[PDB]
Amino acid sequence: TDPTLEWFLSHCHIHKYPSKSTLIHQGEKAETLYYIVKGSVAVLIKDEEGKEMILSYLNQGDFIGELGLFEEGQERSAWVRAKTACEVAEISYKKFRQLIQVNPDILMRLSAQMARRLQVTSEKVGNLAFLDVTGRIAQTLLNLAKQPDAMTHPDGMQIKITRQEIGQIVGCSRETVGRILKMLEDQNLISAHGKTIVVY
Amino acid sequence: TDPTLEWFLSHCHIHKYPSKSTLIHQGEKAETLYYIVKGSVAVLIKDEEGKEMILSYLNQGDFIGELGLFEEGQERSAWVRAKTACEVAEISYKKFRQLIQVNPDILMRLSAQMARRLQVTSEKVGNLAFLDVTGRIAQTLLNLAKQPDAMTHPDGMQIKITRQEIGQIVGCSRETVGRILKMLEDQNLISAHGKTI
Ligand SMILES: Nc1ncnc2c1ncn2[C@@H]1O[C@@H]2COP(=O)(O)O[C@H]2[C@H]1O
Ligand SMILES: Nc1ncnc2c1ncn2[C@@H]1O[C@@H]2COP(=O)(O)O[C@H]2[C@H]1O
Ligand SMILES: Nc1ncnc2c1ncn2[C@@H]1O[C@@H]2COP(=O)(O)O[C@H]2[C@H]1O
Ligand SMILES: Nc1ncnc2c1ncn2[C@@H]1O[C@@H]2COP(=O)(O)O[C@H]2[C@H]1O
């Protein structure tokens, strides 16, 4: 076990969220912090007309809703949706702050995650500003081929994801994804036989 | 001022930097945390064609080069360049990690900034994914119209920014900025002296 994590979790109250549930609504009052004990979620934002973009995938071990923690009166900056059934620990910002004074390590862990997320979203700004849709898709296929849920393949790496998701990640239609995925197969960069894609 | 910052700074070595100097180079090994005591800088990234984009402007009171602090063996994720004459404090991650345990309030101030930056950078992703160039420039102008150095012109808010800088923030050429600034001017909501609009 991890003494610090277990120490922290003992000050939290756990709850469950079924797949497709919305844990955090954008615009909502930020006053609580979350910690994914089990499961995975998606962090989403939207344009004026319902188009959704996935900012990130968070998983077991990741903190959520930390952005309103250092300043009161702030609202949630995005929507968080359960991809799979989730077990989440929740604690008020007030209590977490008291825990910080007790052992700063817990904030160091939270901050490390914030730093990673900043690095990743910054690279996201890069892809959106410098690459055409073909480049973003190809870059996203390579990215996923490194994540944990990524498997090993005799011809490379295998991943499980739908065209809709790819679209929400790179900012394009599922049909555009479908067409681009095929063109990348003709370029012998990947192999698409189902929602499973083999990347070389 | 405040005891916490003075205390923190008393443990730092302060230095001055000319207006166009590079404080941080992307890819370098990270073992140093910086704090802007005076002046301002630009955070940048580049594409494989040399084109640069401004991820953010940082100013007095802002920590910089903090992303490599939470884990060993990390490299700078971007270039940080002074936009004006700077006065920057610095300190080893090793010694900062000790100050954190003596008084976590200093870590709270740094993390507070990381949070804001993540919100702002996430908003940048939205702008790039959902708005056309004209929309991005228009929003960028409104944004700058609240920044540190935003004059109080009678017709509204006055700012100072080059076409090139506008281009680097929204992601387009300075020629496209010029044309669109012209359009925004024929319509309205143009208070930039960067080049007069
Ligand atoms: N760019 C991002 N990358 C990862 N997680 C994010 C990003 N933007 C927002 N979030 C998370 O989504 C949450 C939405 O509500 P909060 O602002 O409380 O906290 C936010 C973060 O935990
Ligand atoms: N610029 C964009 N153009 C089109 N769809 C986008 C864009 N940015 C995000 N999306 C979203 O990504 C989704 C991909 O699958 P859909 O076609 O079902 O719906 C799409 C939109 O919700
Ligand atoms: N999106 C961003 N917003 C603000 N500052 C950033 C951003 N990305 C990188 N930086 C700064 O640029 C630095 C580059 O790598 P560092 O680890 O030095 O720490 C980073 C931050 O201080
Ligand atoms: N997608 C892009 N298209 C054009 N210029 C860009 C883009 N992204 C960033 N830039 C930069 O923004 C700068 C604006 O001024 P310049 O035209 O001199 O040079 C431009 C490039 O360096």
Instruction: Give φ, ψ of B171 to 5 degrees.
Output: 90, 65
Which residues touch B124 (CB under 8 Å, ≥6 apart)? Answer: A125, B55
Q: Which residues, listed in sequence order, are joined to residue B89 by a DSSP beta bridge?
A: B14, B35
C-alpha distance from residue A35 to each of A92, A129, B64, B152, B185 (Å): 12, 32, 27, 44, 49
Query: Is the CB of residue A175 less than 8 Å from the CB of residue A168?
Result: no
- Please indicate, yes or no, whether residues A126 and A143 belong to a single structural domain of this protein: no
- End residue of a domain, out of A113, A131, A149: A131
- Please indicate, yes or no, whether residues B120 and B150 belong to a single structural domain of this protein: no
> Contacts of residue A119 in chain B, CB cutoff 8 Å?
67, 77
Number of Cβ within a 10 Å radius of residue A41 = 26
With 0-12 / 13-18 / 19 or more C-beta atoms within 10 angstroms meaning exposed / middle / buried, residue B155 is exposed
- Binding-site annotation: residue ranges of B for 3',5'-cyclic AMP: 50-56, 65-67, 76-77, 121-122, 129-130, 164-174
- Please indicate, yes or no, whether residues A78 and A115 belong to a single structural domain of this protein: yes
Does ligand 3 lie within 6 Å of residue B76's CB atom?
yes
DSSP three-state, residue B53: strand
d(CA A188, CA A155): 12
d(CA B161, CA A162): 43
Contacting A residues, span 15-74, partner chain B, CB-CB under 8 Å: 45, 47-48, 51, 53, 55, 66-71
- Alpha helix positions (H), chain A: 3-9, 93-102, 105-130, 133-144, 163-170, 174-186
Number of Cβ within a 10 Å radius of residue A188 = 8
d(CA A8, CA B177): 50
Number of Cβ within a 10 Å radius of residue B77 = 21
- Please indicate, yes or no, whether residues B25 and B121 belong to a single structural domain of this protein: yes
Query: Is the CB of residue A43 less than 8 Å from the CB of residue A58?
Result: yes
| B38: amino acid identity, one letter | K
Q: Let me know how long chain B is.
A: 197
Query: Is the CB of residue A140 less than 8 Å from the CB of residue A166?
Result: yes
Method: X-ray
Residue to mutate (ligand 1; options A24, A43, A55, A75; most atoms within 8 A of CB)? A43
CATH number at residue B191: 1.10.10.10
How do strand B22-24 and strand B79-82 relate by DSSP bridges? antiparallel
In terms of Cα–Cα distance, which of A133, A139, A169 is closest to A51? Answer: A169
Which residues touch B171 (CB under 8 Å, ≥6 apart)? Answer: A128, A129, A130, B53, B128, B133, B136
In terms of Cα–Cα distance, which of B161, B28, B144, B54 is closest to A126? Answer: B54
- Please indicate, yes or no, whether residues B19 and B43 belong to a single structural domain of this protein: yes
Residue to mutate (ligand 2; options A172, A175, A195; most atoms within 8 A of CB)? A172
- Work out the angle at residue B169's Cα, subtended by the Cα atoms of residues B165 and B170, and round it to the nearest 5 degrees: 120
- Please indicate, yes or no, whether residues B13 and B108 belong to a single structural domain of this protein: yes
d(CA B30, CA B65): 8
Query: What six digits make up the tokens of A193?
Result: 């036989």
Report the domain count for chain A: 2
- Please indicate, yes or no, whether residues A108 and A140 belong to a single structural domain of this protein: no
- End residue of a domain, out of B131, B156, B189: B131
- Please indicate, yes or no, whether residues B146 and B76 belong to a single structural domain of this protein: no
- Please indicate, yes or no, whether residues A82 and A154 belong to a single structural domain of this protein: no
d(CA B178, CA B162): 10
- Please indicate, yes or no, whether residues B166 and B84 belong to a single structural domain of this protein: no
- End residue of a domain, out of B131, B147, B177: B131
- Please indicate, yes or no, whether residues A90 and A156 belong to a single structural domain of this protein: no
In terms of residue numbers, what domain contains B166? Answer: 132-197
CATH number at residue A47: 2.60.120.10
- Please indicate, yes or no, whether residues A183 and A145 belong to a single structural domain of this protein: yes
